[PDB]
Design an enzyme around this catalytic site. Structure first.
Site, short mmCIF file in Angstrom:
data_model
loop_
_atom_site.label_atom_id
_atom_site.label_comp_id
_atom_site.label_asym_id
_atom_site.label_seq_id
_atom_site.Cartn_x
_atom_site.Cartn_y
_atom_site.Cartn_z
CG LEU A 17 -2.12 -1.01 1.16
CD1 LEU A 17 -2.88 -1.02 2.46
CD2 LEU A 17 -3.10 -0.69 0.02
N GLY A 18 2.08 1.22 0.64
CA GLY A 18 2.91 2.44 0.78
C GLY A 18 4.23 2.20 1.48
N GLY A 20 7.77 4.33 3.61
CA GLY A 20 8.66 5.37 4.17
C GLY A 20 10.11 4.91 4.18
CB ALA A 21 13.25 6.52 5.34
CG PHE A 22 13.13 4.70 9.79
CD1 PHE A 22 13.22 5.99 9.27
CD2 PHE A 22 14.21 4.19 10.49
CE1 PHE A 22 14.36 6.75 9.45
CE2 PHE A 22 15.36 4.95 10.67
CZ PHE A 22 15.43 6.23 10.15
N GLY A 23 9.88 2.11 7.17
CA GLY A 23 8.79 1.12 7.11
C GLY A 23 8.15 0.89 5.74
CE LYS A 45 6.06 1.94 10.76
NZ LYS A 45 6.30 2.61 12.08
CG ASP A 144 3.54 15.75 12.23
OD1 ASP A 144 3.22 16.90 11.74
OD2 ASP A 144 4.10 14.86 11.56
NE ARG A 148 2.25 16.30 7.68
CZ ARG A 148 2.10 17.59 7.97
NH1 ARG A 148 1.29 18.34 7.23
NH2 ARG A 148 2.71 18.13 9.01
CG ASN A 149 0.58 12.72 10.69
OD1 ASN A 149 1.03 11.78 10.06
ND2 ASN A 149 1.35 13.72 11.08
CG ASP A 162 2.75 11.02 15.25
OD1 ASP A 162 3.16 11.50 14.16
OD2 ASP A 162 3.25 11.32 16.40
C1 LIG Z 1 4.47 7.73 18.18
O1 LIG Z 1 3.35 7.03 17.60
C2 LIG Z 1 2.08 7.53 17.75
C3 LIG Z 1 1.72 8.51 18.67
C4 LIG Z 1 0.40 8.95 18.73
C5 LIG Z 1 -0.54 8.41 17.86
CL1 LIG Z 1 -2.20 8.89 17.99
C6 LIG Z 1 -0.21 7.43 16.96
C7 LIG Z 1 1.10 7.00 16.87
N1 LIG Z 1 1.43 6.01 15.90
C8 LIG Z 1 0.78 5.72 14.71
O2 LIG Z 1 -0.34 6.16 14.41
N2 LIG Z 1 1.54 4.85 13.93
C9 LIG Z 1 1.39 4.50 12.55
C10 LIG Z 1 2.50 4.42 11.69
C11 LIG Z 1 2.35 4.05 10.35
C12 LIG Z 1 1.08 3.67 9.90
N3 LIG Z 1 0.77 3.25 8.61
C13 LIG Z 1 -0.52 3.26 8.48
N4 LIG Z 1 -1.10 3.38 7.28
C14 LIG Z 1 -2.32 2.75 7.03
O3 LIG Z 1 -2.85 2.10 7.92
C15 LIG Z 1 -2.92 2.89 5.67
C16 LIG Z 1 -4.31 2.82 5.53
C17 LIG Z 1 -4.88 2.96 4.26
C18 LIG Z 1 -4.08 3.12 3.14
C19 LIG Z 1 -2.70 3.21 3.28
C20 LIG Z 1 -2.12 3.06 4.53
S1 LIG Z 1 -1.50 3.19 9.94
C21 LIG Z 1 -0.03 3.67 10.79
C22 LIG Z 1 0.11 4.13 12.10
#
Ligand SMILES: COc1ccc(Cl)cc1NC(=O)Nc1ccc2nc(NC(=O)c3ccccc3)sc2c1
Length: 289
Positions: A17-18, A20-23, A45, A144, A148-149, A162
């Site tokens: 699906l997508g 980053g550098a670390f995932g 992830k 952040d 986008r988040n 995040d």
């Molecule tokens: C310090 O961490 C936090 C602090 C506070 C909060 Cl509230 C949340 C976090 N953490 C995250 O939220 N983590 C994260 C990372 C990558 C990711 N990839 C996704 N991407 C899809 O699930 C996705 C869905 C549909 C299409 C494409 C990708 S979820 C996710 C969460």
């Protein structure tokens, strides 16, 4: 670590699906995860390396995610730590990130054709605000918060995350300092940029800028300006203009979030209150706003 665990054999990868550098994120099927579904879709992830650097940050992120759970926070089901690669398993959110959704509605199963209506823009804002009430309730500071988040699911459910990938996919929304540091200056208040102080109250300022992105259908705040020109404007006290689609009653809730002195900003609880009452308001009332 009161963190839930899932067996490798219960997870079946379908495609990427997508990245980053670390995932990397995959769509997968997860078996025996929920009583009444024996088969359901999830987003997985994969952690890039498994060193000291990246494995301690993993079991730290997991503990955080298990404690943060609420209707408008992304749903975390747990980890798989049997062999490699290390996986975190989340709820699949079919419309992806809120910035991309706003941009392609600026018809289908979940939304009408044309631009999103006032009642829909209010329903999105009210949901993100409910997330920030729960976080501010646990005395947790995000740092952040931007569209986008956040993610959008079936029936336009909107939930905060995040994501690591946001610095990678949306690098234009960050100012780069030192070596490997990145600041979302367009979303930060004057006391964050000048004094590097981050509070519940720097979060409501950021919420303010989110409400602005929603009512411009995903526009970059200060898009006419370089990163240095944006810092000058914000520190000298200049305000983003009222978006066309933004009623004066709503632009007044944005202003309430942008009061120069942190302690004079409205609490997020009052802001959610103002937004939910509006989103739920009889139509006869929204029509003349
Ligand atoms: C310090 O961490 C936090 C602090 C506070 C909060 Cl509230 C949340 C976090 N953490 C995250 O939220 N983590 C994260 C990372 C990558 C990711 N990839 C996704 N991407 C899809 O699930 C996705 C869905 C549909 C299409 C494409 C990708 S979820 C996710 C969460």
């Amino acid at each position: 670590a009161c963190v839930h665990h899932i067996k490798r054999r219960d997870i079946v990868l379908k495609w990427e699906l997508g990245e980053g550098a670390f995932g990397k994120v995959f769509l997968a099927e997860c078996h025996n995860l929920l009583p009444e579904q024996d088969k359901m879709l999830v987003a997985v992830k994969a952690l890039k390396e498994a060193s000291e650097s990246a494995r301690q940050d993993f079991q730290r992120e997991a503990e955080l995610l298990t404690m943060l759970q609420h209707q408008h926070i992304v749903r975390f089901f747990g980890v798989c730590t049997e062999g490699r690669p290390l996986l975190m398993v989340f709820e699949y959110m079919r419309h992806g990130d809120l910035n991309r959704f706003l941009r392609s509605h600026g018809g289908g199963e979940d939304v009408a054709p044309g631009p999103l209506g006032l009642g829909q823009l209010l329903a999105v804002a009210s949901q993100v605000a409910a997330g920030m009430v729960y976080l501010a309730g646990l005395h947790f500071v995000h740092r952040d918060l931007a569209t986008r988040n956040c993610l959008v699911g079936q029936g336009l459910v909107v939930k905060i995350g995040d994501f690591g990938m946001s610095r990678d996919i949306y690098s234009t929304d960050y100012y780069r300092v030192g070596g490997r540091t990145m600041l979302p200056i367009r979303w930060m208040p004057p006391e964050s940029i000048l004094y590097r102080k981050f509070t519940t109250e720097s979060d409501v300022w950021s919420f303010g800028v989110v409400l602005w992105e929603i009512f411009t259908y995903g526009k970059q705040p200060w898009y006419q300006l370089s990163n240095t020109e944006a810092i000058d404007c914000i520190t000298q006290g200049r305000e983003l203009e009222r978006p066309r689609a933004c009623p004066p009653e709503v632009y007044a809730i944005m202003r309430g979030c942008w009061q120069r002195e942190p302690q004079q900003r409205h609490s997020i609880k009052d802001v959610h209150a103002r937004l939910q009452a509006l989103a739920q308001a009889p139509p006869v009332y929204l029509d003349v706003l």
